[PDB]
Design a protein around this ligand. Sequence first.
Ligand code: TSR
Ligand code: TSR
Lengths: 361, 360, 119, 110
Amino acid sequence: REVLTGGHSVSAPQENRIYVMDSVFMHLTESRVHVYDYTNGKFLGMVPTAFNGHVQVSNDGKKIYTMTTYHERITRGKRSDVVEVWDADKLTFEKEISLPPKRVQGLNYDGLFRQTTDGKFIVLQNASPATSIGIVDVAKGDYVEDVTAAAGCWSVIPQPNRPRSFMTICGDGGLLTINLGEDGKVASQSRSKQMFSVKDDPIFIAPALDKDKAHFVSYYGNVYSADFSGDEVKVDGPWSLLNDEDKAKNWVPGGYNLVGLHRASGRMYVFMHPDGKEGTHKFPAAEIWVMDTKTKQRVARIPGRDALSMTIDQQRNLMLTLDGGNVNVYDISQPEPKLLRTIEGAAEASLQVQFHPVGGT
Amino acid sequence: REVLTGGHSVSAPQENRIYVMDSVFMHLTESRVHVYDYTNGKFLGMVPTAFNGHVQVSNDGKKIYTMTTYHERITRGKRSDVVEVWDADKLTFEKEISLPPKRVQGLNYDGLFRQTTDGKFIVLQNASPATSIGIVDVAKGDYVEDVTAAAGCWSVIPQPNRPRSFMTICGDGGLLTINLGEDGKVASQSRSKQMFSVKDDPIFIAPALDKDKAHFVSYYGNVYSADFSGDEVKVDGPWSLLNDEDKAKNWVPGGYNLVGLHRASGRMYVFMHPDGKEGTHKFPAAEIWVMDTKTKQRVARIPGRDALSMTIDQQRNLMLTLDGGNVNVYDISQPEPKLLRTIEGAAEASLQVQFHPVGG
Amino acid sequence: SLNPDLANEDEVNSCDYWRHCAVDGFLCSCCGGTTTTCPPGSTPSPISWIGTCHNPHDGKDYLISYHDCCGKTACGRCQCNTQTRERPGYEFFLHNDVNWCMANENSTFHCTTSVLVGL
Amino acid sequence: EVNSCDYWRHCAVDGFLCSCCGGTTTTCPPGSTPSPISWIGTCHNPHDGKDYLISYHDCCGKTACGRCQCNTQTRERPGYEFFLHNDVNWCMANENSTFHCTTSVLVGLA
Ligand SMILES: *NC(=O)Cc1c[nH]c2ccccc12
Ligand SMILES: *NC(=O)Cc1c[nH]c2ccccc12
């Protein structure tokens, strides 16, 4: 009467999909991506990603890129660091791209595995432990070469106003900007003035990213900016997230992918907690604060639901938050976010959720 | 000042060690063996076993053997089924032995991965899905024989009174006995008469193993035996584990590695539950029953603690039980088991625990 | 009774659904597939354990093939361990404590289901 | 005491304590391999009131220990001050980079 068949595509359309990167830290060699429908909490499929996988979706929405490490015998044998290209709709493996055996192994901050605005190059963090940035040419299926200029820096912030430019945060407290040629090699670079004091006011690496500028929050609740609208980056800050009452209660930010920006309104979203002190920078959110980056005023505060990471969708005006296991879906079309639902048990140990891209040209 | 060092041996004597095979079914590609000290519940170390690993300790207590499956890219690429030899004290990998790509992938019943009494040969179950038994020469590090005579049979019961003999349960309800030569190739074989009715009274594969015979329990609570004191196995049964009262509440056996024999006393240990009916053969134990196999009568019963699998240490008079996550340690020196301790969170999903061999 | 795709998903995704009577594993219908379709990127097994289950909705007995979907890591959802008429490995095709992905190109176990063969 | 995340030496551990994994604060469990590199912390000793440099070497080449998970962050900083950072695998340069557990090696007075 019936026959079990494969070859099927994901049941829900792309615009319903989100990707929860489950590190499965307790069994980190079997990390995976869980694909969910955010409109109803339905589990749609998954992509296996071996040891401490990282993931992103191609800007054009057609493919899922993963980055992982294999060994011939898992805990022994030769190492293979790879990027893999998977079909988004069929959730099937297509191509492996070999990397040098130094891709970053670590928690899933967005900035460790990114791509150029034009989608032609994947841009990833290496640590051997010496740091450099890796460039992969997606079309060719090749690793280009190490961006050695980035030694002593960390993470990738693409510039959405340029086709193949990105920045990284360096140990001098400034930003290094890299502009790639059509072959994925470094064509030019520049270094900003010092944005923040590494010793006195360290920033979280997660950017609140606009089309031509990026904002960063600090361990002490200050905000810094890198404006890349002109030929070289202009830096500024601090301004404080905190009013007098806030300061009196020692409110500070905490989390991993802990900020987001809604570009059309300029609202910045930040996970915050009271009783801040040395060691609290990764504490779950007591609250989410919504700041107007133009007026430098807070415009809303809502319960944080112990969230640790978030992501923003500009095309649907949404924020997702994530506490390690459960994903909260918020409507952010008005200053006060509205909670639509929570997807329970999306992951065992995820610090990163991302939307399937819609539009964005 | 301090320096981090490696190369250390397990901190407790062999005689204290137990091996909890964690399938980690929720993440079955990262299965592993957890090593504990049964005397105090201390975690001593572990051996990684990739996808659905199986494990045993060498009879001489020197080495740990694992059986597992790798692929070049885990979920794609070329398959490698292997046996691995590990040092028992350093918990380090020593040798890989290539197997044909048909080693049994399934839950951890003892009988799927065993060894000859003399320890010179590893004897393992294959399924392609056609079944056969594979023989690995430990010294040579080679797969040396493939017992197609065993097609349609399942699991390996070693004969403790011979150096290189074992039995398997076949689709006719009898036993095939294989005697290996000193080269690991089949030296001879024999087939018993039918022991049990496959359709009418199926047995659990787990033996309650004596030096010269093995007992088996059935889905309906009967007991069968295979006596190998001679060259030809003599079979008998059934007798019933149940008296009339027992039958009134439909007590039957249930679990996985569900029975055990204390050889010095002939006491047989069996996990049991009430309200038995079709489909309850893997239910957790409501009770453990202690049966005198000489008189064919129960002598004691105790709470089962939801246990599913057990193992016995003969020389210290110990029984371990395991409910999937926790290990209970019982003193069985007297007919009524005494609960000594429970080791909580010994595994996420384990159906098999084994003691370090001490008997040489 | 015979057409899970027309049923409430809560019903088909339950280990007590009548056709799942010898399932040991994660139901594929909870894993982005349906009762008769592997989740995207996982491959049906060409072999399976089999058995019959009673349908109390129409009072008839049906032959079921418990095929797996394979080549992806464990789905983890809707784990069942039901055992009606299940028998040990000496009646191998009735046995559910083995990986029925075992002869696939990649034998990693993803999820299991219950395919309706006939009366 | 040493198997508790609040033990003073463990002030920047993000991982599983090796002392709960068949090892000790300064020995890897059997069959796991020390990392030659590590993040470092400065931790306060509540007994003598002095601050001490701790080197958070990992033990590597076996799958996750899964016991005594800690995530303490005293003086921890992001990857732009890389050797103070603990959200990366300090097994990353080992022959086999699989992460097993984290140690808390006392170097000396800050
Ligand atoms: N029905 C299945 O194939 C699922 C299953 C049940 N037991 C095991 C053991 C190993 C692999 C897959 C398994
Ligand atoms: N640093 C450690 O000892 C453990 C740890 C914490 N986070 C990660 C991520 C990847 C690998 C190891 C990790």
